[PDB]
Each structure stands twice: as structure tokens, then as C-alpha cells.
Design a protein around this ligand. Structure first.
Ligand SMILES: NCCC[C@H](N)C(=O)O
Ligand SMILES: NCCC[C@H](N)C(=O)O
Ligand SMILES: NCCC[C@H](N)C(=O)O
Ligand SMILES: [Mn+2]
Ligand SMILES: [Mn+2]
Ligand SMILES: [Mn+2]
Ligand SMILES: [Mn+2]
Ligand SMILES: [Mn+2]
Ligand SMILES: [Mn+2]
Lengths: 315, 315, 315
């Protein structure tokens, strides 16, 4: 039985564009809870986290909205740990990706042996010192890696953070826009990744076999899937802040999640970067939201080959 | 030499939406016969079957237009058997997919050892008792399977039907929207299928190798290809009644058919669900029809690598 | 260090449609040189070749603009040989594909052991006698093959030509519209090709492994990549004269070039058939040009997994 703990995280200060804080609203409105219940799901809604306003939040060097970002993640981390303690798969509806700091942090408090699969067009592994944009949704992973401890300065709002994952406990899928400093970190820490080049070369089937084998080979452990919707091609998820052409297909998106579901190890899930305000047309918004919902439903059992209850349908 | 027997089947009562009965007209108008003759083809047109009107046709339980559907298939079955007896590959231009009952039935009368490849987003294997829509284009296969005998009630208009295929003589390709009862039947009868998940995992190349090996491994026998245009993604065939996103690509569509042609065993072909009335724009109609024609031409020899006559072109 | 020699070739008389002679202008305007320099590139611009007008140029049989086409290639051949002699990878911005005669001819003068990879929806291997269109952009390869010597009549403007490649030194990728005579030549000379059917069957990964192994297996030698933008699907490069559906994806396009770059053997490059005048909308033009630029940048090092300088980014 797949029990879920819904957590709305209407937050946008990890990046410039507003509208992404509406992600939880549009997804819910799309009937996400209803459709989840329509499946074999036990759904508990923990509501939308109220991210109080932090008016005084000047940049730290070039890092923008550090206290707002830091606080939102700290709050989310607490909520996620609570859902896990209740024996439910945490489902965080974003919101920009900076929230991954809180989501993965809170998840690790309850399940320290977790492994992370990061589906994204970006690595979001810039440090406060390697970033050129200063946008925190491009730095979450750097705050989480134990190996990057010593390279992360004391940024206001993140004193509560304690790196909880090692370079070896995370796999990237979908990369196609990686910054120079980010690439350096990838190669230096020996991080496992399947950029779009590897997906083209091997096919999504082998990519997933290798990804799960890499993380679950030595032993089984909880899986945390942080899914940035811009990991998929803009033809499928156009309403997002940092779209990059040549992305994962709708089919590959569903394949990744169907395979993750089949492990029975999904422990935490993030659906990030859905920004309804960035849809060039009303249809682009629904296309984006519909795809995000589809990806979510696949994570919890919906299979393209079909699904049926433990009953005799012919009798 | 590939000799063809064209059979127009302007029928739509297996489903709600009208316009699909125009399929034969638009395909022909697209120059299908001319282009077929432009190849190495011997083409004989048997015309469009005149499906007399059956005004009195109330539902059987929830099954709609049973007598109309039953009669159209009975007529088509007779026509197809006639074309086969003339030593020609029957080419049925639909028309909704309920016609598969007649097409495969008539084909089996002449070639009982036939194997079926079903390209579709759906399994169309609901029984009159498992269907929720009552639309007969979602039940053709149930009427044809010998194993499902005993589960098919006496529906008005189908007393002439005699299941002619076993669960082991059919392979599905493209599935992505299968009903619960349908999935139950798939798993219970051990039916071979390659849903979109398997195509993503293995690639269309291995899918076809396995499909042909599965049906022709023990021995060679006539192949019946029932191609529902909604098997391909709506980006290629939008003018259809039951479109589902994440479908087979134009390329995969041509690959399936090129490979089937190469066997030299194509015996019967169905081109179904083309509905010109459902095109949101004039271009969507031509896009759909053009793709349907392309698929058809590939079934009869047109290869993307090129084609040339048994002559010395350089001399 | 990858040093490049830019050569603008604003020529269109190898085909009917004007506008393709604007290819060098739109690509440059797109910041191609700037972006190349933004990489690890040493860029030298040799300018746009001034293709003087040849008013008196009646057809040779049905072959159109023979003297204009012949002269433009003769000029380009000289320029390319000059760039190679300067130790730089020649980068020819077309212009229609008839220019390949000059580009590959001039390249071979300096590097006779070169191997050619031809990415295109067409084989462009018609002879002046097998062509039905008379358009010379559909015949460049026939003029270059040593084996086709004796089948090429004395066409005005090409007396300077001397076939420089053998059937075994070229590989085609992307074929989907090959003429009958062309197919005959393919099979008769035993030319290695991966039509769209082979790409579907094997996947672009194996296609490239086989392509490079085929050309570099016996020994390493300079590679000449003649890239016709219509090799990619029209959804990515619509502004081109002879588009054909079911082409290579944006991803496959980048994969081919990333793999070629990694060999360290790219010696000559052609970016052909970009026609800004054929864009049905301003967006179709930018989409086409943007993709052409992306393909070019990949040939010279830009990797989707990321790039970084030989420095310590964390310090
Ligand atoms: N989440 C997008 C991050 C984009 C860019 N690498 C940055 O650091 O801003
Ligand atoms: N041919 C489409 C059938 C769709 C649905 N499974 C049904 O039974 O109506
Ligand atoms: N470059 C396109 C060539 C198209 C056709 N095969 C021809 O010979 O004109
Ligand atoms: Mn991203
Ligand atoms: Mn992200
Ligand atoms: Mn269907
Ligand atoms: Mn169907
Ligand atoms: Mn071409
Ligand atoms: Mn060409």
C-alpha cells in the first residue's frame, strides 16, 4: 500500500520569476489528490506551508534572498520529517527547486541511508561562491553534499543546515545546461550522472537499470526523487523558469518514474519548477500541469500497460 | 509481387463520433491507390462496402449499436474472404476499429493459421460485460479470442461470429490506455504485449525482433496487421476519436511496417480510426491522412533507405 | 586546441530556391563566431567568398546552372585547401549542398586520406544522367567518387574536378528520401549507410560507434563532416529547401557531432542548406538557425554534460 503525505510548498525566492509559488494551487486544481485516490492510494494532505514574509533580506555577496530561501527550507525540512515519521511518502509540490535543501534534509533525518535521483536539465550544484546568477535554486545540492563542506560559506538563513548526502548517493538524469564550476565539481567528486548525451547513447532503459543498480546494488534503501519539470523537453513542460531544448521526452519521463515505482522504494518525491505564469498560452499551462500530474501518478503506480485490482474481472 | 485488394469500410457505429466513416474517402483522395501503383504494386479496388442502415438497433445492456456493428463486420468478413481467395493482401480502409471483428474473421476463414499484430494505444479487448463505454470499437478482440468463449453473451448481430484466434496468436504494440478489466484479461490469458513502457525500455528495433520471433518462431504463417492510427502519437495523427499522448513516433510507425513488409508474410491489413471531422484545423487532417498513407505504403515495400527496380541504373 | 577557419559560401544555384545564399549572414548574425570564441576556440574568419555572376549558363542536358555551380566549387576548393594548409579545421557556411564538391575536393588536396560522414535526408549522389530534377545539390557525391568515373559526362564548369574519395571512405546518416538510381548506386558500390530505418533499429549510439569504427577502424585519418540541415527533422530545421518528415532529432543531431568532436579528428565541416527565406514564420527561421549553431558548437567541444577549463573551480 502506497500512503502519501502531500506538502504544498508555494515558494519562489530561490529564483527571479514569480508565479512558481502557484505550483501547488494549479496541480491540486488539476485533481491531483482525486486522481491519486482513484488509484491504490492512501492520501493525506498536510496542506500548504505558510512561508511568512522576510522583508529584510539583502543579498549575501551575490546570493539573493538567502534568509527567505533558508527559512522556507528549514520549515519544509520539519514538515517532511513529520510526514516520514507518519510512515508516508512525502510529496512536495513546489515551488522553486531551492526547496530541495529542506525536502532532502528533512527526509534524511528520518532515513539517513537515502539515495537521491535528480531529474533535471541542470545540476543545481553551484556553491554560493561558484554561482554567477546568485539564484539559490541553482545551488541546493551544494548545501547537501558532505564533501562540499568547507566550500560553503556561512550564508544567512542556513546555519541549521547539515550536509546529509555523499557524492556517491546521488544520480543525475537529463543534464544539458551545466555551469563550468558545476562540471568541475561533477568530475572532481566523481558524481554519477546521465546527461542527455548518455540517454541518447544508452537509451532510457539502460539508464534506469544503471541508475537503480548504482544506488541499490550494495543494498536497498529509501529513494528520494527530486523532479524538476524542466528536465523534460519544453515541448512538454513549457511553463517553467529555466527551459532548455533537447530534453527528456514525455515517454522517458514516465519511464523513469514507472521504474522507480516498481522498486517499491520511493520514499520522498519533489515536483518542482512548475510556473503557470510563464505559459505563453493557456494551453501551455495545462500542457505543463497535465504532464507534471502524469509524472506524479506514475510514481505511485499508474502503469501504461494498465492496472487492475486483486479481483477476478471475468468471474 | 505484392498484389493488394482494397476494401473501403465507411463505418462508424462502433463508437460515438461521426466522421470516421469518411476515412476511405480521404485516404483514396490522398492518392493512396495511385501511389501504391507507383510502387511494385498490383492493385485491385473492391470498392466501398455499402453498409445498409439499421434504424432499429437499441442497446444490448449498455453495448451500443450492436446490430449495426455486427452486420457491418459480417459483411466485411465476407468481402475479405473473397479478396484472400483471389490471392491478394486485403487492405481495409476504416472506419472504426470494431470492423476488426469482420476483417480478422474473414481472413481466418481462408488462412486459419494467421498471426495478428495489433498496433494501438488501446487493447480493444473489453467484453460486452467489462466495457464501461459500451462502444464496440473497444471490444473487437474479445469476440475473436477462443479463450474468451463463454464470457461473450449472445449480443444481437453477432451470432455469425466464431472466435478464430488464440491468446498466443496476437501481439500488441503501443499500449498506453488499458482498462482494468482489459489488463486482467491480458495477464490472465498470458497475451504478449509491448506497451509504450516496453518500447521505451527495449527500443522499437528489439520490440519488432521479439514480435516477429514470437509469432513466426515456431513456423511461418500469414500475418494480419490491424493498425489503429491512434497508436501513433497525436502529434502525427490528431484527427482520431480516442487520442492518447506519449504514442509511437512517425519513425517507429514506419519501422514497424517496414519490418513487417520485409517478412514477405503480410496477408491482411487494417488502417483504422482516421476521422477527418476531428481535425482541429485543415492541416491536422492532412497530417493525419498523410501519415496513414505513409504507414500503408511502407507495408507494401516503400523503404526509407530507397527502392529501385531490377535494372542497371548506370548502364 | 581546436583552431577554426571560417568560410562563408553564399551560393544557391545548385538548386531552385533563393535565400539559401543568406545562410552565412544569418549564422554569423546569430553570434556563431562569438560563441565559438566563447569556447576553447581559436577562430579565424576568411570571409565570404565572392561568387562572381555567370549570366551565360544554359543547362547541360537537364543539369541546371552547371558553370555557376562548377565555378563556385572550384573557388571554394581553393579556399578550403588554403585554410587546411594553415592548420585549421575548415568550416564552410552554406549555401546549397552542391558546394560539397568544392569543400571535399579542396580538403582532400591537403588530406587525401580523409573519411567523410554525410548527415542528410538525401544521398545527393545522382549523376548528371540519373538526376530527374537537374538540381546540382542532388549530385555532389557522384562527382567525388572515384568509382563513378566514366559515368560522369563532361559537364561545363567541372573540368577541374578529380574524384578524390572511394565508395569505402564515406558513411551516410539520416537517409529517408533516396531516388531509385541513387539507391542502385548505394547497393552497387557497397556504400555504408544508416538510413532512418537503421537509426530506429540500432539507436544513434550504436550508429555512431559503427560509423567511426567503419572509418577509423583500420587507422586514424582526418574526418570531413558534411552536414545538411534537412538531415534533422523539419520540426527543428524547417527553413530549408528539401525538408522530409521523420528526421533526426535535435538530440541525435547533437549526439552525432559530440561523438565526432571526441575523436579529435574533425578536419573539415560543412553546414549546408539553411534558407532563411523558407521560414513560414520569423520563429521558424530562428529555430532553424539556432539549431544549426548548436550543431556547429557541438562539433567544436560544447558538451551537454558541461565543459570546464583546466583550473580548480573550488580552490
Ligand atoms: N535551477 C537553474 C539553475 C541555472 C543556473 N545554473 C544557475 O545557477 O542559476
Ligand atoms: N477503441 C477505444 C476503446 C477505448 C475504451 N477502452 C473503451 O472500451 O471504450
Ligand atoms: N539535395 C536534394 C536532392 C533531392 C533530389 N534527390 C534531387 O536529386 O534533386
Ligand atoms: Mn532545472
Ligand atoms: Mn532544478
Ligand atoms: Mn485506439
Ligand atoms: Mn483500436
Ligand atoms: Mn538534403
Ligand atoms: Mn544535401
Amino acid at each position: 500500500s502506497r500512503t502519501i503525505g502531500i506538502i504544498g510548498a508555494p515558494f519562489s525566492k530561490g529564483q527571479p520569476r514569480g508565479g512558481v509559488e502557484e505550483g501547488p494551487t494549479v496541480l491540486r486544481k488539476a485533481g491531483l489528490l482525486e486522481k491519486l485516490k482513484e488509484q491504490e492510494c492512501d492520501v493525506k494532505d498536510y496542506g500548504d506551508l505558510p512561508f511568512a514574509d522576510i522583508p529584510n533580506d539583502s543579498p549575501f555577496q551575490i546570493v539573493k534572498n538567502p534568509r527567505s530561501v533558508g527559512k522556507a527550507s528549514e520549515q519544509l525540512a520539519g514538515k517532511v520529517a513529520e510526514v516520514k515519521k507518519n510512515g508516508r511518502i512525502s510529496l512536495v509540490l513546489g515551488g522553486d527547486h531551492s526547496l530541495a535543501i529542506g525536502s532532502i534534509s528533512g527526509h534524511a533525518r528520518v532515513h539517513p541511508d537515502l539515495g537521491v535521483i535528480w531529474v533535471d536539465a541542470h545540476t543545481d550544484i553551484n556553491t554560493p561562491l561558484t554561482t554567477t546568477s546568485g539564484n539559490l535554486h541553482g545551488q541546493p545540492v551544494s548545501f547537501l553534499l558532505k564533501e562540499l563542506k568547507g566550500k560553503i560559506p556561512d550564508v544567512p538563513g542556513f546555519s541549521w543546515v547539515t550536509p546529509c548526502i555523499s557524492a556517491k548517493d546521488i544520480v543525475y538524469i537529463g543534464l544539458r545546461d551545466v555551469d563550468p564550476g558545476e562540471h568541475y565539481i561533477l568530475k572532481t567528486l566523481g558524481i554519477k550522472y546521465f546527461s542527455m548525451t548518455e540517454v541518447d547513447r544508452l537509451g532510457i532503459g539502460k539508464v534506469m537499470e544503471e541508475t537503480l543498480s548504482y544506488l541499490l546494488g550494495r543494498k536497498k534503501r529509501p529513494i528520494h526523487l527530486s523532479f524538476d519539470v524542466d528536465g523534460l523537453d519544453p515541448s512538454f513542460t513549457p511553463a517553467t523558469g529555466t527551459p532548455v531544448v533537447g530534453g527528456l521526452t514525455y515517454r522517458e519521463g514516465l519511464y523513469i518514474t514507472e521504474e522507480i515505482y516498481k522498486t517499491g522504494l520511493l520514499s520522498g518525491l519533489d515536483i518542482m519548477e512548475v510556473n503557470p505564469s510563464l505559459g505563453k498560452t493557456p494551453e501551455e499551462v495545462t500542457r505543463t500541469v497535465n504532464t507534471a500530474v502524469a509524472i506524479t501518478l506514475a510514481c505511485f503506480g499508474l502503469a501504461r500497460e494498465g492496472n487492475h485490482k486483486p479481483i477476478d474481472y471475468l468471474n
